[PDB]
Amino acid sequence: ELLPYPHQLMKRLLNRISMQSQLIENISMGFLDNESKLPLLCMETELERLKFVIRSYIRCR
Amino acid sequence: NTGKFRYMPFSPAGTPFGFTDRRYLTMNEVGYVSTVKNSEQYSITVSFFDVGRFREYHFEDLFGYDLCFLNEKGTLFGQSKTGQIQYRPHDSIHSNWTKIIPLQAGERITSVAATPVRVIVGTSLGYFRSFNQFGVPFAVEKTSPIVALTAQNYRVFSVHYSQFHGLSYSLSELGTSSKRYYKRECPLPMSLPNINSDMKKDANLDYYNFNPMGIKSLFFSSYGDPCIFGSDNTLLLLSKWRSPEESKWLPILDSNMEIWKMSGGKETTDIHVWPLALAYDTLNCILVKGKHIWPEFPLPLPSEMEIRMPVFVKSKLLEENKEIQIPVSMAAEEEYLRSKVLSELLTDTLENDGEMYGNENEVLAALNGAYDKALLRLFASACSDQNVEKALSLAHELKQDRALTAAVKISERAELPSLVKKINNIREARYEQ
Amino acid sequence: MSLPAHLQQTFSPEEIQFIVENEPIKIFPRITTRQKIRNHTRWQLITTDDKALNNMVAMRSTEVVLWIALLLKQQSKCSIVAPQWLTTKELDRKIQYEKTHPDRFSELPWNWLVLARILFNKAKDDFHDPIHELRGKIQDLREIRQIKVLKGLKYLNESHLQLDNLSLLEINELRPFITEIMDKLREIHTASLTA
Amino acid sequence: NDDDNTEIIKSFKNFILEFRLDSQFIYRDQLRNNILVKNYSLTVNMEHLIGYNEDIYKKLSDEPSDIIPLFETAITQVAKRISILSRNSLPTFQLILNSNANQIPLRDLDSEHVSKIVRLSGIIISTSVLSSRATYLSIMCRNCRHTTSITINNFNSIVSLPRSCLSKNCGPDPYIIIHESSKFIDQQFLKLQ
Amino acid sequence: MYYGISQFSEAYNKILRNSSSHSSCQLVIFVSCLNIDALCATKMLSLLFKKQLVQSQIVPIFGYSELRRHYSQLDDNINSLLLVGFGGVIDLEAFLEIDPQEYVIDTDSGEQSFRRDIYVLDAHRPWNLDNIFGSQIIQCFDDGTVDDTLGEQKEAYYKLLELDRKQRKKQIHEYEGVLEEYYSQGTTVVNSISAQIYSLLSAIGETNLSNLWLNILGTTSLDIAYAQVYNRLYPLLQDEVKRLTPSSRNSVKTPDTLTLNIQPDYYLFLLRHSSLYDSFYYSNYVNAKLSLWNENGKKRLHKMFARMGIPLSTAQETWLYMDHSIKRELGIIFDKNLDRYGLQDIIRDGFVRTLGYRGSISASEFVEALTALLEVGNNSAQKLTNLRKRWVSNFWLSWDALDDRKVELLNRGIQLAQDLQRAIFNTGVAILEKKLIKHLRIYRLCVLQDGPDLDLYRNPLTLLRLGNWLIECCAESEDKQLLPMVLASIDENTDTYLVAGLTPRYPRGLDTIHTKKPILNNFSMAFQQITAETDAKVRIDNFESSIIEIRREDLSPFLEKLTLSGLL
Amino acid sequence: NGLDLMDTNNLSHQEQEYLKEYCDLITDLKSGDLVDIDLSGSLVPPSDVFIDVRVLKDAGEIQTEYGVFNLIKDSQFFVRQSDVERLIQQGYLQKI
Numbered sequence A: 001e002l003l004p005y006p007h008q009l010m011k012r013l014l015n016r017i018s019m020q021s022q023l024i025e026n027i028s029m030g031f032l033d034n035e036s037k038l039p040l041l042c043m044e045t046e047l048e049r050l051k052f053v054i055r056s057y058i059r060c061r
Numbered sequence B: 001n002t003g004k005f006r007y008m009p010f011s012p013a014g015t016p017f018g019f020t021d022r023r024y025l026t027m028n029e030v031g032y033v034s035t036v037k038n039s040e041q042y043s044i045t046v047s048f049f050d051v052g053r054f055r056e057y058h059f060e061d062l063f064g065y066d067l068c069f070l071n072e073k074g075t076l077f078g079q080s081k082t083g084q085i086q087y088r089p090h091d092s093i094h095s096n097w098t099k100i101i102p103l104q105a106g107e108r109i110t111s112v113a114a115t116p117v118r119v120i121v122g123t124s125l126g127y128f129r130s131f132n133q134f135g136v137p138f139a140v141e142k143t144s145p146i147v148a149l150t151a152q153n154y155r156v157f158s159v160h161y162s163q164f165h166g167l168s169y170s171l172s173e174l175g176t177s178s179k180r181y182y183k184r185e186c187p188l189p190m191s192l193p194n195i196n197s198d199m200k201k202d203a204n205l206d207y208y209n210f211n212p213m214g215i216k217s218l219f220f221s222s223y224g225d226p227c228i229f230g231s232d233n234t235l236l237l238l239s240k241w242r243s244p245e246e247s248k249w250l251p252i253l254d255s256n257m258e259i260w261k262m263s264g265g266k267e268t269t270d271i272h273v274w275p276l277a278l279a280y281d282t283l284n285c286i287l288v289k290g291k292h293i294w295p296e297f298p299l300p301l302p303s304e305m306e307i308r309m310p311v312f313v314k315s316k317l318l319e320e321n322k323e324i325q326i327p328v329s330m331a332a333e334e335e336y337l338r339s340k341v342l343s344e345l346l347t348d349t350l351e352n353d354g355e356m357y358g359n360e361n362e363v364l365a366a367l368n369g370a371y372d373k374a375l376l377r378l379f380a381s382a383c384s385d386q387n388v389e390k391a392l393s394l395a396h397e398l399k400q401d402r403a404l405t406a407a408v409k410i411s412e413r414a415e416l417p418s419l420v421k422k423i424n425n426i427r428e429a430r431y432e433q
Numbered sequence C: 001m002s003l004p005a006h007l008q009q010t011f012s013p014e015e016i017q018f019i020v021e022n023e024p025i026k027i028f029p030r031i032t033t034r035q036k037i038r039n040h041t042r043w044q045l046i047t048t049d050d051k052a053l054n055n056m057v058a059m060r061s062t063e064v065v066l067w068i069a070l071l072l073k074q075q076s077k078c079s080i081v082a083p084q085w086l087t088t089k090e091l092d093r094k095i096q097y098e099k100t101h102p103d104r105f106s107e108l109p110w111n112w113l114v115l116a117r118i119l120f121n122k123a124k125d126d127f128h129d130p131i132h133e134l135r136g137k138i139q140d141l142r143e144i145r146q147i148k149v150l151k152g153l154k155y156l157n158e159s160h161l162q163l164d165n166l167s168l169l170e171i172n173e174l175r176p177f178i179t180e181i182m183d184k185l186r187e188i189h190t191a192s193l194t195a
Numbered sequence D: 001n002d003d004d005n006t007e008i009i010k011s012f013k014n015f016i017l018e019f020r021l022d023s024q025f026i027y028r029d030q031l032r033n034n035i036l037v038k039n040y041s042l043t044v045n046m047e048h049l050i051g052y053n054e055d056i057y058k059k060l061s062d063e064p065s066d067i068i069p070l071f072e073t074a075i076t077q078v079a080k081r082i083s084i085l086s087r088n089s090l091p092t093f094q095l096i097l098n099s100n101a102n103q104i105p106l107r108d109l110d111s112e113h114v115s116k117i118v119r120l121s122g123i124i125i126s127t128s129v130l131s132s133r134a135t136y137l138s139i140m141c142r143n144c145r146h147t148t149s150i151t152i153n154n155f156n157s158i159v160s161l162p163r164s165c166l167s168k169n170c171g172p173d174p175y176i177i178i179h180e181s182s183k184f185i186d187q188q189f190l191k192l193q
Numbered sequence E: 001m002y003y004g005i006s007q008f009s010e011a012y013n014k015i016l017r018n019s020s021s022h023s024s025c026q027l028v029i030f031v032s033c034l035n036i037d038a039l040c041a042t043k044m045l046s047l048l049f050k051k052q053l054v055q056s057q058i059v060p061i062f063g064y065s066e067l068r069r070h071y072s073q074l075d076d077n078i079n080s081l082l083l084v085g086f087g088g089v090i091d092l093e094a095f096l097e098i099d100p101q102e103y104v105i106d107t108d109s110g111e112q113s114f115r116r117d118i119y120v121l122d123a124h125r126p127w128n129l130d131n132i133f134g135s136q137i138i139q140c141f142d143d144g145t146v147d148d149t150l151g152e153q154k155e156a157y158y159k160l161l162e163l164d165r166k167q168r169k170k171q172i173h174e175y176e177g178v179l180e181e182y183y184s185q186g187t188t189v190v191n192s193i194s195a196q197i198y199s200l201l202s203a204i205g206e207t208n209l210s211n212l213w214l215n216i217l218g219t220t221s222l223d224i225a226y227a228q229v230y231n232r233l234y235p236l237l238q239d240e241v242k243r244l245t246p247s248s249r250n251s252v253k254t255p256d257t258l259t260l261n262i263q264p265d266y267y268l269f270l271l272r273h274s275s276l277y278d279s280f281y282y283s284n285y286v287n288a289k290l291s292l293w294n295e296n297g298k299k300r301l302h303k304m305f306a307r308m309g310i311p312l313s314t315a316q317e318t319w320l321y322m323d324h325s326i327k328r329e330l331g332i333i334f335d336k337n338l339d340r341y342g343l344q345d346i347i348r349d350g351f352v353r354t355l356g357y358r359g360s361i362s363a364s365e366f367v368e369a370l371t372a373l374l375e376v377g378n379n380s381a382q383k384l385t386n387l388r389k390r391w392v393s394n395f396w397l398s399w400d401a402l403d404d405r406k407v408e409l410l411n412r413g414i415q416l417a418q419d420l421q422r423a424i425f426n427t428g429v430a431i432l433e434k435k436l437i438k439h440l441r442i443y444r445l446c447v448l449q450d451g452p453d454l455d456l457y458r459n460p461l462t463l464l465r466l467g468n469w470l471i472e473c474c475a476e477s478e479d480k481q482l483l484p485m486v487l488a489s490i491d492e493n494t495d496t497y498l499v500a501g502l503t504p505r506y507p508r509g510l511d512t513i514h515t516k517k518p519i520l521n522n523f524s525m526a527f528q529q530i531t532a533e534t535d536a537k538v539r540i541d542n543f544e545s546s547i548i549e550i551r552r553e554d555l556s557p558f559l560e561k562l563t564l565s566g567l568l
Numbered sequence F: 001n002g003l004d005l006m007d008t009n010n011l012s013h014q015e016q017e018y019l020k021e022y023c024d025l026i027t028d029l030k031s032g033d034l035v036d037i038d039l040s041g042s043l044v045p046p047s048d049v050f051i052d053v054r055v056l057k058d059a060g061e062i063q064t065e066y067g068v069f070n071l072i073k074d075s076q077f078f079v080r081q082s083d084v085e086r087l088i089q090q091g092y093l094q095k096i
Ligand SMILES: [Zn+2]
Pocket: D141, D142, D143, D144, D145, D146, D165, D166, D167, D168, D169, D170, D174
């Protein structure tokens, strides 16, 4: 069956993704002017995993 | 006049050639150095652990170097006979150089140490030549024959052994502009392997041929505490090395006991320990499984071992004759001792060396909390024996007063009403302390 | 439809791998991110804690999420430490335990197969044991567990079932068959019990 | 001979259990799948065996008629190990080989190549009906009623009933076949052109 | 000199600073297809940049026109370009229409920086002085020749640069003459790109067994044509193999053991993947040593195989399936009966790679398979472009053949190598029967007008392989003096011939004073001068200058003019 | 939805209008509130971030998010899997 929607949890994750993407874009703009890009790649792949999880959840619903 | 008179070249955590053209020179905390014959000569490979600041490099050599020493800013190579030395900074901005050591009859280079201020060379005869980064000499000295060396950022450590004097340590800080000395030819308690060298060993004859005295490595700690390890399989630390009067040689680990108690009960021997460096209870060491003590080029992962004083008694640990069972009663006291000694060592560097990582104060507070937790456990154990005087003696060393309140609760709870009044008296005294 | 048919009620092996990728494991950092007392960007993630990553010290074992460790292992800037169950001795003991008890499964971690595959593929040189022997013993455990599953299948009742200590990948691969056979057996019984 | 047989059998068992190209034990998986569908056989590729160890291939090619039954016994032991929980009645498996050796012309087969391994081609022109060759043969002693069993390799050297009682004399031919307890396999005769 | 061996790491770090921005892909790698060494070097660089996660573009180029068209299409964001296997002999800034002023950024301060930095890597010795000296955008990775043997050339070039009376004109003429005699020299190669990048990698310290194997393959790629360079570089690869191999020798073979070994690697053709008899029959050295194109050659081949006492059926059996007796006494058998027929040079020591139970493989067989995959992996200016497309596509097949997970592709490459050797052998025997080679006092012309599988030779590498066959065959003919041969093949679809200027070489194993002196292919300037005048719709676009496409009608006049030309 | 919008003769007029409006509805759902995530994105987990690809169909030059991609046929990129998903879905890049 269709389980109840966790509205608060999805709202918090949406806010987190919005602010995280904004922070990533700000870091990229600052870097577009050391060269430790490993954390930036980590944020990118982490955000990708989170987005994939939420996409799969929503489509299953 | 043989065997130990052969002051054969030795490097921190060395290795013999064994049965191959290969050989490990030095295994420091910042990397390792290895040799190999190209069927006629050695090509020397230097690799680093901090991948991200240094880069591995292998270079051609025709001289056949026999000694090595590694640092954060440069590494030094040396030859046993006709001991030409070669110092190469890791960074390309500083030009590498080489020079010839003044060699004499019967002279053989034992060990070399490099410090960002000066470079010093050991000698079988016992010389203490001191140089600079670029090779220009500064001073030449002679003492008891040096056989091993270690260098921190600015302090160095040496062991002087001779067939007349024995094993005497000396720790001195060269410094940027202050050649401050902290010890000189003072004796040391390391046990030397002699009985095992009396033609009763399995494949250790080759290693003893490589290193006659079986000293494994003399690395420092993350905060500058000298450490010793050898065939006795026991670490040694200098607790209050700062004060010359406060010398304290403390055993911090026993490799055979730890190996046996982690092996499930078997007194296995094929497990040998190669320590690289100790850093606040983090003793990195290769645990090689087999008949060959020295490691290989598919280098085993430097598994970390924790410190354990040899308070473990085999008679007590044989409660379950054969996951080795641990009797908690003295195990808690062992943890108490660990916390006490680590608190002493951390405090030593707290006021002098200051903060290193930004968390030393917090870990110190947590360690003190664990110290009083172990004290409370021992207090409860003493109260279990209805020894009011034993509990009273244990209660004096409690540091946190929350542990003092817990001691009051234990006294009123562990069937000792008489202990309650004396613990309350101690707490009232502490109120004014 | 929004969800493809093959993803309707089961997880693809890629999904199981992704789920297992979030397990924490202990690794040896080959870099040292501990910013000294004397710039740089922190990981500051939201699916996990950045505290260990910002405070890594070279050749000092820490614990991080598995997929970050794999990402670092794409370079030589880290090193994976095999869990204690990935030793030859523990595998042999589990083999003996399985051969001793024919009716119950071993107490392996639920993600052992996928973890073994990932470590063999991407961390093939971080094992103290000969990898050619670890692969064989892993395959032997998989075969023995399969044999046990097949014998436990001959008792497919219509009420319930207890697959105790069974791993995750085996459950995922057996879900579409067992959960469909069980449905038909339940439906037959319910139709019979229509009075 | 028993020691050498055990050595070869153990070597072949190790070959089966260990051989793999890339993270997949091909022969183990093939044997398991064949057992799954009650197909007690195994197709062994020749280059795989050669690459595993040339000595095994040389010993096989020298006297195949004696090496192959040991390989079949090792296959049966592996099947018992990895298809049945220890603590039977499984038929001996049939070996199948695949090779890429030069195909010798049919008329080039001569006085040599006898008892060797030969690869060739042709066209089938006659397929006889299936006869039965015994593998497990329960046998009964005629007079003293001493029943035993015989295992037949079906690989003719270049076998008959024992010519003694083996525990009163019972005659030089004291044995009779126990048909209702013996085990047989199918055999077909083909004619190639 | 621009970039010496000792300062390659500086160029690496500069490139890393320039284009280690994962937001974009500002580094592009240009590689000349139909060149094994360039493919190996590009694989090294691709693996290295996969390590540092630097986004890169790999573009296989066949002709110069493609290079200029791509550069015109090239976007301005890309601040770093890599040329592999070409560009070190031609005026790139003139070829690509490049001036320093458009690309220069932050000019100030005795320094200069540029918005796009191009780094070339080829070992062709005619180093373009305007590219090695008079530019900052063009960056060349010298192998020690320019800094040591072009000092006078450097002085003359700088004198001309600084000077843009009678004695002044005299000295200008002398300097120009020195520069010109430096030029007008046949294109020759002294080093292998794989060795250079392996040295750079060792300076960076990111070497491994795979990179060493790639360097072995790249160096072996130059053995057939530049055997002197191969002998020069062999000890370095040998020492690297000794260094990198683990001390745990004679270990039990596991499906995971990857072992590089130095063992007798006889100079045969696909020995481990073909019969011994076929290996001898298809070996270029043996064929040249006995001239197998005549009917006597096969009889003498049987004569050797009888003389060693090896049965012909055994010799004709596949290598894997031979009896272990011969497979373990091949070395002694060669020792006994090789000097008798003069084939002692066949015995050689090479590098063999073994990957678990997959069987061994030699470098020569691997490079032959790679070349075969390059050649046959799959109105007038349209179908030719499709041929370029297919030739470039085969580069990726050869590239993916390097993966150990694609051994099926390697098997197809081995089969293609066998078939190509068969076709080249049959073409050579037919040509030497009909005597299509017409000897002159300048060059031995040979044009294929009609016959079998003539569509195979429009691929440049196929024509070069046929040239290797015929030049090896003619090299062992002491009566036939040293002289280049010219090969042409009419493409009926395009009605054009493919003229391939070749060069003679000394017989393999024949080491003399003149052998140390390399043969210089002077077809480049001759072709270009003949083409510049008397417009004949000639298409000279190959990085190998001694290859042109000529109209069928203009083929004969072009050859007549070339005979009238004494430049080569 | 991210691949192509297509022989419609196999569908009745009601079905064609249904598909036309359903694409609009899907786009409305993607742009309504869950716009930060791509609802039409791949359902396979993003196991790896950087991959290599080969150009199948030459598309000249296409501006990516930050730089630009020169989709020369028979040329291989090694770039992030994130910004090339749509191109691979359309059928321009092949390698994984
Ligand atoms: Zn009888």
